[PDB]
Amino acid sequence: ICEECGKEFMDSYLMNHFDLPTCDNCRDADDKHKLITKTEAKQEYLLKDCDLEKREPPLKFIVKKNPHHSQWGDMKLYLKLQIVKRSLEVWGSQEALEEAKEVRQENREKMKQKKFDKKVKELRRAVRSSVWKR
Amino acid sequence: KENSNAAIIKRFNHHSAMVLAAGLRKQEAQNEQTSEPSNMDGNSGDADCFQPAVK
Amino acid sequence: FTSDAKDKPIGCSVAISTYSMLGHTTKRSWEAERVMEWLKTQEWGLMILDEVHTIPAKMFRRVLTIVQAHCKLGLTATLVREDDKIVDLNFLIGPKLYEANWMELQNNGYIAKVQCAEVWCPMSPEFYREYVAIKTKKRILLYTMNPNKFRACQFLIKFHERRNDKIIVFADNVFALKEYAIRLNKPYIYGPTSQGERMQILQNFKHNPKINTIFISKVGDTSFDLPEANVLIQISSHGGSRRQEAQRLGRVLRYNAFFYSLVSQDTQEMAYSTKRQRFLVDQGYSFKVITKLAGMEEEDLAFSTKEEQQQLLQKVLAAT
Amino acid sequence: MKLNVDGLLVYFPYDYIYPEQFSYMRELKRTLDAKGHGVLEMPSGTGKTVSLLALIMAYQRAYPLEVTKLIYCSRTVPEIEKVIEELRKLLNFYEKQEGEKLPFLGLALSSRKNLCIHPEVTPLRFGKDVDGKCHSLTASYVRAQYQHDTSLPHCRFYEEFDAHGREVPLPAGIYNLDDLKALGRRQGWCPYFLARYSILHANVVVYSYHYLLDPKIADLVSKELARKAVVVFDEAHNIDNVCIDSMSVNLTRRTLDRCQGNLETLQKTVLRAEHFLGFLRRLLEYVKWRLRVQHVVQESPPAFLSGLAQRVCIQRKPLRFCAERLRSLLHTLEITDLADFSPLTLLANFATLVSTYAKGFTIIIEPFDDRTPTIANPILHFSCMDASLAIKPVFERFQSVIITSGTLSPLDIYPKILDFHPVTMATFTMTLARVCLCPMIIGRGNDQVAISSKFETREDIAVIRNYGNLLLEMSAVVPDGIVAFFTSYQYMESTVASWYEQGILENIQRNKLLFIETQDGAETSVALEKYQEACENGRGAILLSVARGKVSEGIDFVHHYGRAVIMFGVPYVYTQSRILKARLEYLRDQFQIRENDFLTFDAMRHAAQCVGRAIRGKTDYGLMVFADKRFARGDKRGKLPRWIQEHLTDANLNLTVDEGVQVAKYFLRQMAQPF
DNA sequence: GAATTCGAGCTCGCAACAATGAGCACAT
DNA sequence: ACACTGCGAGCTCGAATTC
Numbered sequence A: 001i002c003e004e005c006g007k008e009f010m011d012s013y014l015m016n017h018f019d020l021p022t023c024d025n026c027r028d029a030d031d032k033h034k035l036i037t038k039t040e041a042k043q044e045y046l047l048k049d050c051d052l053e054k055r056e057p058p059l060k061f062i063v064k065k066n067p068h069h070s071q072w073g074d075m076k077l078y079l080k081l082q083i084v085k086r087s088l089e090v091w092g093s094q095e096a097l098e099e100a101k102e103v104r105q106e107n108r109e110k111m112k113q114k115k116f117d118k119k120v121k122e123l124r125r126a127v128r129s130s131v132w133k134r
Numbered sequence B: 001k002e003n004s005n006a007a008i009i010k011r012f013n014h015h016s017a018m019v020l021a022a023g024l025r026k027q028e029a030q031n032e033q034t035s036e037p038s039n040m041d042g043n044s045g046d047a048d049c050f051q052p053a054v055k
Numbered sequence C: 001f002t003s004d005a006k007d008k009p010i011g012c013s014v015a016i017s018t019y020s021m022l023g024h025t026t027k028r029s030w031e032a033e034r035v036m037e038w039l040k041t042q043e044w045g046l047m048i049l050d051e052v053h054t055i056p057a058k059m060f061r062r063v064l065t066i067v068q069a070h071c072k073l074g075l076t077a078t079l080v081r082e083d084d085k086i087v088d089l090n091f092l093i094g095p096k097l098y099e100a101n102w103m104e105l106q107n108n109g110y111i112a113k114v115q116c117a118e119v120w121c122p123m124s125p126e127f128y129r130e131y132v133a134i135k136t137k138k139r140i141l142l143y144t145m146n147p148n149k150f151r152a153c154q155f156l157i158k159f160h161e162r163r164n165d166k167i168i169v170f171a172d173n174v175f176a177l178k179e180y181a182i183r184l185n186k187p188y189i190y191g192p193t194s195q196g197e198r199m200q201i202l203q204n205f206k207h208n209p210k211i212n213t214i215f216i217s218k219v220g221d222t223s224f225d226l227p228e229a230n231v232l233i234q235i236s237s238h239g240g241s242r243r244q245e246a247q248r249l250g251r252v253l254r255y256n257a258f259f260y261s262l263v264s265q266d267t268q269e270m271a272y273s274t275k276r277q278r279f280l281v282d283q284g285y286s287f288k289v290i291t292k293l294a295g296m297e298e299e300d301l302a303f304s305t306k307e308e309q310q311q312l313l314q315k316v317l318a319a320t
Numbered sequence D: 001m002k003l004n005v006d007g008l009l010v011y012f013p014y015d016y017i018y019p020e021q022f023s024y025m026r027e028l029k030r031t032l033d034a035k036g037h038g039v040l041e042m043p044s045g046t047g048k049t050v051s052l053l054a055l056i057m058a059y060q061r062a063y064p065l066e067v068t069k070l071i072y073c074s075r076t077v078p079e080i081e082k083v084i085e086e087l088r089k090l091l092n093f094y095e096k097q098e099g100e101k102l103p104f105l106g107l108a109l110s111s112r113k114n115l116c117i118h119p120e121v122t123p124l125r126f127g128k129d130v131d132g133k134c135h136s137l138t139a140s141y142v143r144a145q146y147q148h149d150t151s152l153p154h155c156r157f158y159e160e161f162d163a164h165g166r167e168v169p170l171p172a173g174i175y176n177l178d179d180l181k182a183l184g185r186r187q188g189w190c191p192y193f194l195a196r197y198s199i200l201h202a203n204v205v206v207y208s209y210h211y212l213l214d215p216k217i218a219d220l221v222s223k224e225l226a227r228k229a230v231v232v233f234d235e236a237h238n239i240d241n242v243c244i245d246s247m248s249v250n251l252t253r254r255t256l257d258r259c260q261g262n263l264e265t266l267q268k269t270v271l272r273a274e275h276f277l278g279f280l281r282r283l284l285e286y287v288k289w290r291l292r293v294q295h296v297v298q299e300s301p302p303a304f305l306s307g308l309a310q311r312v313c314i315q316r317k318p319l320r321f322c323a324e325r326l327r328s329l330l331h332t333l334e335i336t337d338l339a340d341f342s343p344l345t346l347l348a349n350f351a352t353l354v355s356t357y358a359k360g361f362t363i364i365i366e367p368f369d370d371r372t373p374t375i376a377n378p379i380l381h382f383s384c385m386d387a388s389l390a391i392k393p394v395f396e397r398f399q400s401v402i403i404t405s406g407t408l409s410p411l412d413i414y415p416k417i418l419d420f421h422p423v424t425m426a427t428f429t430m431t432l433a434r435v436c437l438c439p440m441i442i443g444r445g446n447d448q449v450a451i452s453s454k455f456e457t458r459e460d461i462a463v464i465r466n467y468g469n470l471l472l473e474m475s476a477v478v479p480d481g482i483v484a485f486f487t488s489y490q491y492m493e494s495t496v497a498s499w500y501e502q503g504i505l506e507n508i509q510r511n512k513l514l515f516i517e518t519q520d521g522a523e524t525s526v527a528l529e530k531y532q533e534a535c536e537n538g539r540g541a542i543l544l545s546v547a548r549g550k551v552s553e554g555i556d557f558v559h560h561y562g563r564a565v566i567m568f569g570v571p572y573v574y575t576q577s578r579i580l581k582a583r584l585e586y587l588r589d590q591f592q593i594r595e596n597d598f599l600t601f602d603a604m605r606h607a608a609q610c611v612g613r614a615i616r617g618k619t620d621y622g623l624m625v626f627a628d629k630r631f632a633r634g635d636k637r638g639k640l641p642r643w644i645q646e647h648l649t650d651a652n653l654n655l656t657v658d659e660g661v662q663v664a665k666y667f668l669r670q671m672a673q674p675f
Numbered sequence E: 001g002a003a004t005t006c007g008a009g010c011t012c013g014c015a016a017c018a019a020t021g022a023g024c025a026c027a028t
Numbered sequence F: 001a002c003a004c005t006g007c008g009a010g011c012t013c014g015a016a017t018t019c
């Protein structure tokens, strides 16, 4: 049972890892999807942990070896069409996503400059307190 | 270089199989010396064999 | 429902949450939004509202219209509160059901027999020179960092460390917390410490006879897990609130145990300290007055000379 | 006591039930009416056994057609005798409440070394010898000349059993192992074959795991017994390791040269069929050729079967009947002993396992040995990965199978490893009149130094001193017995020796004697009886041992034996062995279990089994420290079960060594006082 | 009526995570 | 084809007194 080509098949690379009825003949390696890791689904499409495992339907992942560790731990992989379908479900339209990213991408450079004034107001407080008194 | 790293693990297995053989001394009836030197010879059976592995 | 563990809060029988979780007026998290959608549509029975005296505020009284309940029990310890809003509470919850006779529970052994005492300290002549010069809020530092008040806390700590008593030194105005607890080398819960080292200071105080004192600052003004103090040397707390000085009293009764109240005399703090005993004299508590201690001038008390007393005025008045 | 579960009339043999134990029977009834499996967890050993047997024995009275037989799989023979003795206590309670007799019989099965009457065969020590000395006295060619009834060697108990022990069954009277020998003595029958014959007509049957989980055994004793039964897997926290070791053979050079001697002595007997000997002489050459390599470790689970047909040209179709014909060739040869041919059966069992079972298996040939670059002792492992290829007959044949222990650490790993779907998957927790356990995680040392038993934080003396400063300062406040499990033998030996070179072990010996558990059995049981005597008088002892040892799984520390149980680190397995590094590859693709989340699950079920060996009873109190920083994290302390996690607060979570004593001293003072 | 001081809580981003040892019960 | 549990940041309240 499929939906893209409608063929009857027992199992494929999909529908046992992501629950998607898609045959393994074409498989669309760079056509319909890619394999996006977990850390790219948090900083690009801006989803918290309450979006990948609590919003119905909860989507699952694939564990694999870490590329630059080889003895340490995991590397989770998600299906790319399942992420951008979830980002449209959590954040209204697609033209609300990047517009929310502009006010977020300025908050780190706001932290970059507000770190540099508390470093001024504290180091100048140590020398102004010695001259104000008498 | 493995031999000098294996000559130390025997050298305080001789002095950590003593503490159980002395731990039975502080209790009541002592252990027989033919059984405490049985596994100690078995632990020395590899260390003496590996002694000729890098002699 | 306290936003750290959240042990499946939807679909249960007893839910234990906080104020400003149920009446959080801003945009909620997604895990909290699903539980508040569940809690808003199920009728309860017997809500329990601990710390009832904070309900008549603007935010915490919106809780009683968010959640529907048949019965509403309110359990408190100190019903008094400034700004006259306890008469407001007679229709938010209900009529006053029972009030415990405080002198009767003491006479039956359910509450420790507290010997209240208000030792007041003379003002140093170098410090009273500046206390009457200015009126604009710098004089609050000048009566809480009094050098003669420092000698009455260092003496009262030593007098009960030699009796193996557990001392808690409640002190607001956090600059006076630092310059009291590092000149005696004692631990202090500063208030912006952590959750971690807040715990380990609180538990070496209980099960260890080596750490004897602890210098809290406006943290123990609620129903916290403070571990059974024996004395309580309150130094210059918040201004005229008789709610607070009945919550510091609850740390002592949890003469067996007895708490002090250090007051720099001939200042504004004398008017405050009789406005805070305005509630405790209505429970039969007798507040003695100690003018001179039991030999304060004969031990190794700090701030002995005048050159070490002149440096503190150059540190306190330098803040502004 | 006519206790009422939601549909039954359960006759309980006591007066006070615990409020958690009554809810155990409600969830146990919820499995049997749904005709499905169940993963339950309840801490104690007794009380759990008498409540499970109270419901199911009462369940087969109200519905005598839905369930008929109860199969109770316990770990080994001491718990087999314990369950039967709790069953007649319930049966005699039924004898007083009704005043009648019942058509109700209950047996217990074990090896031939336990049920044995004949004198020349009983005093044999090893278990694999008593089967052979039996088989020389009872085989079908030995009884072939007994049709003349002459003075040839024979067993009088077996030859009497088949003439009279068939028409009459066992009447009543729940039987132990010793009661079955007493019945076999005074009647003159075999105790072993009477238990095996009467196992088909019974109501409660108590044997070990290996009559049901082992595939080459369960088709001999439990194939036609019951299609509507109830299986209980008692104390089955390590149920997956039994399922792997049953279907995994291990071959080395020491075994293979003994198969050359068996193939030598078979060639002298055929001259006194022959194509089968050249078959095995071909196969023994290939397995020795694969062990002959000195190269990298390699894995090839169905590609072994291709190279076995390349140089040797043996297909896989006759290889499936390799172990079958060898069982038949020794029958027609009429060999006396069969323990001598044990390597050749082990090679023939290896041949019939690589031919059929290849989906989740592996073959690991390891020429480079453990830690040494050149020691001539290679070994090939035929290691099983998928632990659900041994319960797939058990999950299908029976009606309901209930996996119960006290330390099922997460309840969702067990239906993921084992491919089944339970209907309850419930947990429980004991209720107490006090708080009879005070767990604590003694983390950082007395000078704010981490305490962990990692691999890089083992040889520094800032951690070995903080282990020595802990066992010293807990041996002065704990009365009468401390069990200190280490993580290995080479770490226990390299820490007590490093406490002796410093001045720490002389200050522990002043308080308590210290006894060390060693690998050999004679010095261990000697050092275990002086431990249990030093806790009875006023001396007080310390039994410091390892975590995957004999004392941690067999010995049950009752009250005032081990008031404290000190875990000296998280008891991991060797995480870099080539067998385990291949099993986690199968556990990562199949079932998507993360490789870090399985080592912690395996370790928190051994660190909770031996810690949970300190409380057995209502009046038993017991300290249980966890002397490792790594226990404090969320993915490790959230795995230890819900009856030792509901008392682990957040104050007792990163305690230092000196603060861990004033929670130890305050708890032992509170517990010492009457109710 | 609109600031302060010091406290509280809930969201959420930030940065960087780990995993080392050793043996007897059960079938023809 | 990287990344778990802890933790200070804003945000918004509170009690009580101030400016």
Ligand code: SF4
Binding pocket: D112, D115, D116, D117, D118, D121, D133, D134, D137, D138, D155, D157, D158, D190, D191, D192, D193
């Ligand atoms: S046949 Fe019976 S008597 Fe003979 S060895 Fe077996 S169990 Fe013992």
Ligand SMILES: [Zn+2]
Binding pocket: A002, A003, A004, A005, A006, A007, A021, A022, A023
């Ligand atoms: Zn398709």
